Design an enzyme around this catalytic site. Structure first.
Site, PDB file in Angstrom:
ATOM      1  N   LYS A  63      26.038  30.146  25.714  1.00  0.00           N
ATOM      2  CA  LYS A  63      25.363  31.328  26.241  1.00  0.00           C
ATOM      3  C   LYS A  63      25.121  32.318  25.123  1.00  0.00           C
ATOM      4  O   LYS A  63      25.935  32.410  24.205  1.00  0.00           O
ATOM      5  CB  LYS A  63      26.228  32.005  27.297  1.00  0.00           C
ATOM      6  CG  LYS A  63      26.848  31.079  28.305  1.00  0.00           C
ATOM      7  CD  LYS A  63      27.874  31.840  29.137  1.00  0.00           C
ATOM      8  CE  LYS A  63      28.587  30.942  30.160  1.00  0.00           C
ATOM      9  NZ  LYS A  63      29.544  30.012  29.529  1.00  0.00           N
ATOM     10  N   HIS A  68      23.987  35.110  28.751  1.00  0.00           N
ATOM     11  CA  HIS A  68      25.293  35.466  29.261  1.00  0.00           C
ATOM     12  C   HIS A  68      25.379  36.633  30.259  1.00  0.00           C
ATOM     13  O   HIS A  68      26.137  36.573  31.224  1.00  0.00           O
ATOM     14  CB  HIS A  68      26.199  35.700  28.067  1.00  0.00           C
ATOM     15  CG  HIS A  68      27.626  35.381  28.334  1.00  0.00           C
ATOM     16  ND1 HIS A  68      28.489  34.973  27.343  1.00  0.00           N
ATOM     17  CD2 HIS A  68      28.354  35.452  29.472  1.00  0.00           C
ATOM     18  CE1 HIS A  68      29.692  34.807  27.858  1.00  0.00           C
ATOM     19  NE2 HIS A  68      29.638  35.091  29.149  1.00  0.00           N
ATOM     20  N   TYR A  81      31.957  30.287  38.605  1.00  0.00           N
ATOM     21  CA  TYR A  81      33.117  30.393  37.730  1.00  0.00           C
ATOM     22  C   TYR A  81      34.088  31.316  38.467  1.00  0.00           C
ATOM     23  O   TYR A  81      33.708  31.967  39.451  1.00  0.00           O
ATOM     24  CB  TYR A  81      32.746  30.949  36.352  1.00  0.00           C
ATOM     25  CG  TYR A  81      32.243  32.371  36.311  1.00  0.00           C
ATOM     26  CD1 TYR A  81      33.070  33.436  36.634  1.00  0.00           C
ATOM     27  CD2 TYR A  81      30.962  32.657  35.866  1.00  0.00           C
ATOM     28  CE1 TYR A  81      32.638  34.749  36.504  1.00  0.00           C
ATOM     29  CE2 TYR A  81      30.520  33.965  35.730  1.00  0.00           C
ATOM     30  CZ  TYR A  81      31.365  35.008  36.046  1.00  0.00           C
ATOM     31  OH  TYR A  81      30.952  36.307  35.854  1.00  0.00           O
ATOM     32  N   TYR A 110      41.333  42.452  35.988  1.00  0.00           N
ATOM     33  CA  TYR A 110      40.971  43.849  35.971  1.00  0.00           C
ATOM     34  C   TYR A 110      41.915  44.615  36.867  1.00  0.00           C
ATOM     35  O   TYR A 110      41.924  44.448  38.093  1.00  0.00           O
ATOM     36  CB  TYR A 110      39.532  44.139  36.398  1.00  0.00           C
ATOM     37  CG  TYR A 110      39.285  45.618  36.191  1.00  0.00           C
ATOM     38  CD1 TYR A 110      39.327  46.164  34.901  1.00  0.00           C
ATOM     39  CD2 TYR A 110      39.220  46.499  37.276  1.00  0.00           C
ATOM     40  CE1 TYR A 110      39.334  47.538  34.693  1.00  0.00           C
ATOM     41  CE2 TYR A 110      39.226  47.885  37.077  1.00  0.00           C
ATOM     42  CZ  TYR A 110      39.290  48.399  35.780  1.00  0.00           C
ATOM     43  OH  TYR A 110      39.350  49.767  35.571  1.00  0.00           O
TER      44      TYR A 110
HETATM   45  N1  LIG Z   1      29.429  33.426  31.570  1.00  0.00           N
HETATM   46  C1  LIG Z   1      30.353  34.280  32.045  1.00  0.00           C
HETATM   47  O1  LIG Z   1      30.126  35.482  32.183  1.00  0.00           O
HETATM   48  C2  LIG Z   1      31.699  33.729  32.416  1.00  0.00           C
HETATM   49  C3  LIG Z   1      31.996  32.356  32.269  1.00  0.00           C
HETATM   50  N2  LIG Z   1      33.252  31.857  32.617  1.00  0.00           N
HETATM   51  C4  LIG Z   1      33.448  30.377  32.396  1.00  0.00           C
HETATM   52  O2  LIG Z   1      34.195  29.824  33.464  1.00  0.00           O
HETATM   53  C5  LIG Z   1      35.357  29.113  32.941  1.00  0.00           C
HETATM   54  C6  LIG Z   1      36.464  29.104  33.948  1.00  0.00           C
HETATM   55  O3  LIG Z   1      36.454  30.306  34.722  1.00  0.00           O
HETATM   56  P1  LIG Z   1      37.676  31.317  34.874  1.00  0.00           P
HETATM   57  O4  LIG Z   1      37.153  32.709  35.114  1.00  0.00           O
HETATM   58  O5  LIG Z   1      38.630  31.155  33.755  1.00  0.00           O
HETATM   59  O6  LIG Z   1      38.413  30.920  36.209  1.00  0.00           O
HETATM   60  P2  LIG Z   1      39.201  29.656  36.797  1.00  0.00           P
HETATM   61  O7  LIG Z   1      38.996  29.659  38.277  1.00  0.00           O
HETATM   62  O8  LIG Z   1      38.874  28.454  36.006  1.00  0.00           O
HETATM   63  O9  LIG Z   1      40.723  30.113  36.537  1.00  0.00           O
HETATM   64  C7  LIG Z   1      41.460  29.565  35.427  1.00  0.00           C
HETATM   65  C8  LIG Z   1      42.912  29.377  35.852  1.00  0.00           C
HETATM   66  O10 LIG Z   1      43.031  28.400  36.919  1.00  0.00           O
HETATM   67  C9  LIG Z   1      44.392  27.994  36.988  1.00  0.00           C
HETATM   68  N3  LIG Z   1      44.411  26.703  37.719  1.00  0.00           N
HETATM   69  C10 LIG Z   1      43.709  25.542  37.392  1.00  0.00           C
HETATM   70  N4  LIG Z   1      43.916  24.536  38.226  1.00  0.00           N
HETATM   71  C11 LIG Z   1      44.785  25.044  39.140  1.00  0.00           C
HETATM   72  C12 LIG Z   1      45.409  24.474  40.307  1.00  0.00           C
HETATM   73  N5  LIG Z   1      45.170  23.203  40.670  1.00  0.00           N
HETATM   74  N6  LIG Z   1      46.268  25.285  41.043  1.00  0.00           N
HETATM   75  C13 LIG Z   1      46.516  26.592  40.667  1.00  0.00           C
HETATM   76  N7  LIG Z   1      45.974  27.231  39.576  1.00  0.00           N
HETATM   77  C14 LIG Z   1      45.113  26.395  38.851  1.00  0.00           C
HETATM   78  C15 LIG Z   1      44.841  27.943  35.536  1.00  0.00           C
HETATM   79  O11 LIG Z   1      46.186  28.368  35.376  1.00  0.00           O
HETATM   80  P3  LIG Z   1      47.167  27.702  34.277  1.00  0.00           P
HETATM   81  O12 LIG Z   1      46.491  27.844  32.929  1.00  0.00           O
HETATM   82  O13 LIG Z   1      48.449  28.485  34.475  1.00  0.00           O
HETATM   83  O14 LIG Z   1      47.324  26.269  34.686  1.00  0.00           O
HETATM   84  C16 LIG Z   1      43.845  28.854  34.774  1.00  0.00           C
HETATM   85  O15 LIG Z   1      44.419  29.947  34.079  1.00  0.00           O
HETATM   86  C17 LIG Z   1      35.623  29.824  31.605  1.00  0.00           C
HETATM   87  O16 LIG Z   1      36.504  29.152  30.723  1.00  0.00           O
HETATM   88  C18 LIG Z   1      34.205  30.059  31.097  1.00  0.00           C
HETATM   89  O17 LIG Z   1      33.756  28.923  30.378  1.00  0.00           O
HETATM   90  C19 LIG Z   1      34.269  32.730  33.135  1.00  0.00           C
HETATM   91  C20 LIG Z   1      34.002  34.103  33.293  1.00  0.00           C
HETATM   92  C21 LIG Z   1      32.724  34.616  32.936  1.00  0.00           C
END
Ligand SMILES: NC(=O)C1=CN([C@@H]2O[C@H](COP(=O)(O)OP(=O)(O)OC[C@H]3O[C@@H](n4cnc5c(N)ncnc54)[C@H](OP(=O)(O)O)[C@@H]3O)[C@@H](O)[C@H]2O)C=CC1
Ligand SMILES: NC(=O)C1=CN([C@@H]2O[C@H](COP(=O)(O)OP(=O)(O)OC[C@H]3O[C@@H](n4cnc5c(N)ncnc54)[C@H](OP(=O)(O)O)[C@@H]3O)[C@@H](O)[C@H]2O)C=CC1
Lengths: 314, 318
Positions: free
Chosen positions: B79, B112, B211, B219
């Site tokens: 992005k 983005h 996502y 926040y």
């Molecule tokens: N373009 C944009 O503006 C944005 C893009 N993104 C994209 O989206 C991706 C992922 O989104 P994100 O906001 O991080 O949210 P997610 O919904 O992917 O949340 C991530 C968390 O999910 C937890 N998790 C995963 N599997 C399980 C499960 N089976 N049970 C319970 N908890 C679980 C993990 O915890 P743990 O590590 O403790 O296992 C991890 O910290 C990013 O990496 C990015 O690439 C995100 C925000 C903005």
């Protein structure tokens, strides 16, 4: 290094808080507690809502056994939650804490927020739409419940947290008042020096215990934070110190009791350094100029509550 | 399992985000990428601003070297940050990226955020009062820069991220439009099903990539963090027991059967694996409209630092 509360008791100017990230295992608290103790920390700030007491309590006890510290060398603060502001539930709450800590008493007991919620186990009761189920309470009534806790010997001192000028006055100007609050624990940092509240608190003999003094989704967690401020970064180089210390010392020389925490043993030790230096009077006036009413912890989840403390200027 | 984009290309309905918690060293990403690759993942969502590309690109290349996967079997997304939305910078970023990743091309390139900032190395330029230095840009001029990147072959497909109705309309109803955005990557979950934006995007052949589909509770401080959390939602926890699956899985399954591409991540290898299970079951028609009733306009990723910006996407109903 201590300071003295308006009730004759003394409190350590530097305190290690015990609230843990939602993730971290309650057990983690215990380890971090010990670490701090071995680092010289004698002031521990905790709350019943954090649910780390029983651990923070175990740790303290452990260092009591191997004689690393004496119970009377440890200042332990506990707070009563919003779901227990009804007089009759204030003492059951403190005893419960004591039960988990296995302490006879605590050195400070605070009303966590000037707001109440539906009594019950769930610290955050909510309705079908997901909204916190509020509740009204006569805080002056709650304060009496606290005074009795001090008289009952359950806590050496009492105070408040996240209370605003009016709310504090509401208690001070209380008919029958026996004990004034020894402090108001509120967020305070260079971007929110809380001066207007600080001076009000000083003109009442109440101590302002500061938290969020360093500022705790990808974009927001990667947005410029407090310890990014160039006014600090540079001034930090001046004194060959780290900005976080510059931040710490600043709160200290203001006569503010500063709380603080870290999961990194390397940083925990580093924070004791706040005693290794002083800030020129001219630099202090510089930091006083960073304020910008940036409240990092607004307690959003409460906004629509009759008593939200952050609507007023202070 | 793929799905096709209105540009003739296909995209994996399940992708891995390469964003990392403020702490974690940029390197961690590498390890995490490899892990997920060996778990079935072929769609990797990344972004220049994350600074995890060189690492994410090293993991993919490493896995290509040992014949674990072929390049064409990896759908990689990037992005363009706010600071490079000026037409004359868009392609510079994309190439900057390709350089760190060492990829001839990217499979998807998105804008983005519909907001721009003072061009420069700092991804969060600020003034002496800590405020972000906004900057105005003609999005359509940027989209034209996005289209040329397509033709130049640097990216197979192009889309936008965190655009709202009007902002999408403003691109679609663009005089001389050559390539409609293949998707709108937004935050979406049982507590923010984005339904109204979803339908609009469908009626426009634009896919919706969700996502934050599980709960970042981000926040705010410790206090807000405790507020009702998703994975604890009874409606989910129970329903999970009904299919003998984890709640998070019910959440991933819910977004999939709605024609939504979902992104997800974790630092727990145990969880990264468990994710593929989203393909082992189906939610009944009834259960689907049950989860539809959970919505409550709960935006966990508001991009708070941008509130004051002219193009902050989260003020409109959608
Ligand atoms: N373009 C944009 O503006 C944005 C893009 N993104 C994209 O989206 C991706 C992922 O989104 P994100 O906001 O991080 O949210 P997610 O919904 O992917 O949340 C991530 C968390 O999910 C937890 N998790 C995963 N599997 C399980 C499960 N089976 N049970 C319970 N908890 C679980 C993990 O915890 P743990 O590590 O403790 O296992 C991890 O910290 C990013 O990496 C990015 O690439 C995100 C925000 C903005
Ligand atoms: N009464 C009330 O309403 C409230 C009270 N509190 C109390 O305050 C305590 C701590 O306050 P908190 O709100 O977390 O905020 P702080 O102002 O202590 O800052 C939080 C962050 O500071 C970082 N940090 C610590 N040491 C350093 C260092 N030397 N250099 C750079 N960064 C550093 C930590 O990161 P890392 O962990 O990665 O080291 C941590 O995430 C709590 O545990 C609690 O007891 C907190 C909120 C509200």
């Amino acid at each position: 290094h201590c300071v003295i509360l308006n009730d004759g008791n003394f409190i350590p100017v530097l305190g290690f808080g015990t609230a843990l990230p939602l993730e971290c295992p309650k057990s983690k608290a215990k380890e971090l507690t010990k670490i701090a103790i071995d680092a010289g920390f004698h002031h521990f700030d905790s709350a019943s809502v954090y649910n780390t007491e029983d651990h923070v309590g175990e740790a303290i006890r452990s260092k009591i056994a191997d004689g690393t510290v004496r119970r009377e060398d440890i200042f332990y603060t506990s707070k009563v939650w919003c779901t227990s502001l009804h007089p009759e539930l204030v003492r059951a709450s403190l005893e419960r804490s004591l039960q988990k800590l296995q302490f006879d008493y605590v050195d400070l007991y605070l009303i966590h927020y000037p707001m109440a919620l539906k009594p019950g186990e769930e610290n955050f009761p909510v309705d079908e739409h997901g909204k916190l189920i509020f509740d009204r309470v006569d805080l002056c009534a709650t304060w009496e419940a606290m005074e009795k806790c001090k008289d009952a010997g359950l806590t050496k001192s009492i105070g408040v947290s996240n209370f605003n000028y009016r709310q504090l006055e509401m208690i001070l100007n209380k008919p029958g008042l026996k004990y004034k609050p020894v402090c108001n624990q509120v967020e305070c940092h260079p971007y929110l020096n809380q001066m207007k509240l600080l001076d009000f608190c000083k003109s009442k003999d109440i101590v302002l215990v500061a938290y969020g003094v360093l500022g705790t989704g990808w974009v927001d967690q990667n947005s410029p934070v407090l310890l990014d401020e160039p006014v600090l970064g540079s001034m930090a180089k001046k004194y060959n110190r780290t900005p976080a210390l510059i931040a710490l010392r600043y709160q200290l020389q203001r006569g503010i009791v500063v709380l603080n925490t870290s999961l990194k043993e390397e940083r925990i030790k580093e924070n004791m350094q706040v005693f290794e230096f002083q800030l020129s009077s001219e630099d202090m006036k510089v930091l006083d100029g960073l304020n910008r009413n940036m409240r990092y912890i607004p307690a959003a989840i409460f906004k629509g509550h009759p008593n939200w403390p952050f609507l007023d200027e202070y």
